[PDB]
Design a protein around this nucleic acid. Structure first.
Ligand SMILES: [Mg+2]
Lengths: 372, 469
RNA sequence: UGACGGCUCUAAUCUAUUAGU
DNA sequence: CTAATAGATTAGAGCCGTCA
């Protein structure tokens, strides 16, 4: 008692939910997700407490309805109104109406296998951890011993001007070929400052400001990253505001490094994964590696059409997924590693800056069940 | 090793005082907050625009199906979900003569013909509004595709009307501000998306699987512009007043004239959640700078506080200012000059662009949405875009870039700020969505800015968002 | 301008150094 | 005030995708 008995799935869903919302009890197979007592209950309900009823199976149901009757002796708004009028005219019983039951059924049925799983997960990142720094920051007093238009960025060792000094991580007697008057240099006039205090934030001095010192150090890091990328026989692209360093074609083994494809062919055109180096000291020393895709014609010469570049990049980025991005980033980073766990930036004759080849790992608390 | 935390689901209130997390099904199963009577629509344009609009209004009331229903909910009809009838019977049609259309697409200069088009539409709208016995609910604007397509700013056709903006929609919306008429601008491409094809046999863009969201979005925006509300929030506590701030530039002008506009969440004491733009554009004469002068910023904050107090009855304890740029010392001094006695101010800076890509170890789906990476006490990444367990699909396509929420000034809690920011990603009425990738407090202000930029002589600006969205 | 996201190019603007008086 | 070298911040136009 007190109970009333794949092309229109959502129509039936909405109809049943609305009929429940107005206080009409509806029994359907979409309530009990589990299957396997499935027909005996229906037959028992039909035989015992069924008074009025609203393909081989369809024919059998029609025959059952006919036997029961013999024994008894535009828009959807119009349809809804007709259904309501028919229900009211037939005096079909109803109880107190409430939407709380509908909300609870929706919560416990509609989103059953779509919930939150309390499982910890580990994520990679694009931030390359920085291990160690040289013992000092070197400022060389090159007073009237270099040309004024000498163009400091032409040197083989990273250095940038500052007032009348030169800042680098190399010795005081390097790159003497390009700057011949170097031998008559007194060593007591070179400023050496340790990296630990200036990078951690314990260096307040008039010579250089901490934000300025960070900008100088990231400039040296970017310049040395550029020099290293040039060193490894890797071509370059001059981007809108930065520089990207893309591997050539045939450089790797079968266009593969560590079972990862970084350069390939698309239709009659060649594409090349690239990276861009941008070191920052916030929150902690990292060497960020943003990802890009450039396209060329023969694989060595860049194409001089920005519209073609953007169109090809957007066409290629549709099919890329998290796994591909991770694999390509990690493979490109590992290809520039030196021996086992880190690659140095050649910032000195015998002094190097160690940056690890393993990106920072993030650990979580809540995971997502990813149900196929 | 670094840790990740999770932020609880915000949830949104609906009819009968119920609760849910997804707005679409919250409307479908329960209904909107209020009950409207009907919507009356009026087309300005040719007879073709009339035909297109009538076809669209007939299509909105009918069920809509896709290939797979798992991705998006189906459209059952506007009246059934909002409890108010709106069809092509309460219509007021105003003709637009093709002879007049032809006479303006001849000067080969965008300024003159653009201004002529704006005038030729606005005069018809005002004449219909004034000198007719009918009372249209929302005035609808239909624009021919090709004429505007040739009305691009930096384009040419292959002085009284020359010193004006070179865009149609912005100036047209700026010229109806002093009339306070809810006007909705439709490009003919949107609604007449089925009568335009190419010489290839296949559409360039697959629009056969976004029909449902198109219908939901337009229907929700219209119902909002009719004076109704689709949904609100469940846990808006006292002392909460979200306020937006976005910067825009006027391009073609003698002075740079930096344009800053504001939008404001707050309570209206009607047990609802009313969104009004207490915005009157503030000008920065300096070039390139993105900082309000003390006077203009002080005026903005004072107007927001006065609107709240005259709307509720008391100044809230806490005010949130979501901004796309950082702040200076004198700007924060200006905001602190009008701060009430026993109150505190929080300014959230959301730098959208920052390189940080995360990878799951096994699956190709991206990071879960509501994750939060706490770098420090006054910095965090909040993945406003991400995987949604409710719909099992991805909001974005590629690896999302988490927003860099910095508490630039003031003292607050990172958990509470991140939770409030996540909550504010569902209160848009343009599109009935699950969640937004950017807070609407930083997007509706931008839409206001792009609306009320083409003209600066308007006094008594409109308040509600029916006019601008 | 029915929406959203991811992008390309694009200049402008702030800070520090250098050279045009 | 004016022109070069870096980083760090900002906007603006123009284009691509939504199936599976
Ligand atoms: Mg609008």
């Amino acid at each position: 008692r007190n109970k009333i008995f794949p092309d229109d799935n959502d129509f039936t869903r909405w109809l049943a939910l609305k009929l429940i919302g107005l206080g009409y009890e509806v029994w359907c197979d979409i309530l009990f997700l589990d299957k396997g007592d499935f027909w005996s209950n229906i037959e028992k309900v039909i035989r015992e407490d069924t008074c009025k009823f609203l393909r081989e199976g369809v024919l059998k149901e029609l025959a059952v309805a006919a036997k029961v009757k013999k024994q008894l002796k535009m828009s959807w708004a119009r349809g809804l109104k007709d259904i309501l009028e028919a229900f009211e005219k037939q005096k079909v019983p109803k109880e107190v109406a409430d939407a709380s039951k509908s909300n609870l059924l929706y919560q416990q049925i509609f989103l059953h296998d779509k919930s939150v799983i309390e499982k910890e997960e580990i994520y990679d990142s694009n931030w390359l951890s920085i291990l160690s720094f040289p013992e000092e920051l070197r400022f060389h007093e090159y007073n009237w011993m270099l040309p004024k238009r000498f163009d400091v960025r032409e040197l083989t060792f990273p250095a940038v001007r500052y007032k009348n000094y030169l800042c680098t991580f190399a010795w005081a007697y390097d790159f003497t070929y390009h700057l011949p008057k170097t031998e008559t240099y007194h060593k007591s006039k070179t400023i050496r400052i340790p990296t630990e205090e200036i990078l951690s934030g314990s260096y307040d001095s008039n010579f250089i400001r901490n934000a300025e010192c960070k900008r100088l150090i990231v400039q040296l890091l970017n310049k040395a990253f550029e020099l290293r990328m040039k060193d490894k026989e890797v071509q370059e692209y001059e981007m809108s505001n930065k520089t990207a360093y893309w591997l050539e074609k045939g450089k790797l083994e079968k266009d593969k490094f560590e079972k990862t494809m970084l350069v390939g062919k698309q239709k009659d055109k060649n594409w090349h994964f690239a990276i861009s180096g941008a070191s920052k000291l916030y929150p902690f020393p990292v060497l960020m590696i943003s990802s890009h895709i450039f396209f060329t014609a023969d694989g060595k010469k860049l194409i001089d059409s920005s519209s073609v570049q953007h169109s090809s990049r957007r066409r290629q980025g549709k099919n890329w997924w998290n796994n591909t991005w991770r694999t390509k980033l990690l493979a490109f980073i590992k290809y520039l590693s030196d021996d086992d766990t880190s690659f140095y930036l050649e910032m000195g004759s015998e002094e190097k800056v160690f940056v690890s080849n393993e990106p920072v790992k993030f650990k979580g608390n809540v995971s997502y069940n990813i149900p196929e | 090793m670094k840790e990740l935390i999770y932020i609880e689901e915000p949830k949104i209130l609906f009819a009968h005082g119920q609760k849910c997390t997804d707005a679409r099904d919250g409307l479908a199963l329960f209904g909107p907050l209020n009950n409207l009577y009907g919507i009356k629509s009026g087309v300005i344009g040719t007879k073709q625009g009339l035909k297109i609009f009538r076809d669209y209004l007939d299509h909105i009331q009918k069920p809509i199906y896709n290939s797979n229903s798992i991705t998006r909910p189906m459209f059952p009809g506007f009246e059934a979900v909002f409890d108010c009838k709106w069809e092509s019977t309460g219509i007021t049609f105003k003709e637009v003569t093709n002879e007049d259309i032809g006479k303006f697409l001849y000067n080969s200069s965008t300024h003159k013909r653009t201004y002529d088009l704006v005038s030729l539409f606005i005069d018809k709208i005002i004449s219909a509004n004034k000198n007719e016995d009918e009372n249209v609910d929302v005035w609808f604007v239909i624009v021919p595709d090709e004429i505007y397509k040739y009305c691009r700013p930096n384009s040419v056709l292959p002085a009284e009307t020359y010193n004006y903006d070179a865009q149609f929609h912005d100036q047209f919306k700026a010229r109806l501000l002093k009339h306070t008429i809810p006007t909705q601008i439709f490009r003919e491409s949107t609604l007449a998306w089925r009568d335009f094809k190419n010489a290839f046999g296949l559409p360039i863009r697959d629009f056969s699987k976004i029909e449902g969201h198109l219908a939901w979005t337009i229907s929700t925006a219209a119902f909002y512009k009719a004076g109704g509300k689709p949904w609100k929030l469940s846990d808006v506590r006292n002392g909460v007043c979200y306020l937006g701030l976005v910067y825009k530039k006027v391009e073609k002008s003698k002075n740079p004239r930096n344009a800053c506009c504001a939008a404001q969440m707050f309570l209206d004491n009607g047990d609802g959640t009313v969104f009004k733009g207490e915005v009157g554009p503030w000008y920065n004469p300096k070039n390139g700078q993105y900082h309000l002068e003390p006077k203009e910023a002080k005026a903005l904050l004072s107007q927001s506080l006065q609107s709240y107090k005259e709307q509720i009855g008391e100044y809230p304890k806490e005010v949130f200012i979501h901004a796309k740029t950082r702040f200076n010392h004198q700007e924060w001094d200006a905001f602190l000059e009008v701060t009430p006695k026993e109150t505190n101010l929080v300014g959230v800076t959301i730098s959208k662009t920052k390189p940080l890509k995360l990878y799951k170890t096994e699956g190709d789906y991206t990071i879960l949405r509501g994750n939060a990476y706490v770098v420090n006490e006054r910095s965090a990444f909040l993945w406003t875009v991400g995987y949604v367990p409710k719909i099992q699909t991805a909001l974005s396509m590629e690896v999302p870039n988490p927003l860099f929420i910095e508490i630039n000034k003031g003292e607050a809690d990172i958990k509470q700020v991140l939770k409030d920011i996540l909550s504010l990603t569902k209160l848009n009425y343009n599109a009935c969505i699950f969640a937004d990738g950017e807070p609407v407090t930083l997007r509706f202000a931008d839409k206001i800015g792009e609306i009320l930029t083409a003209s600066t002589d308007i006094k008594t600006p409109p308040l509600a968002f029916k006019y601008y969205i």
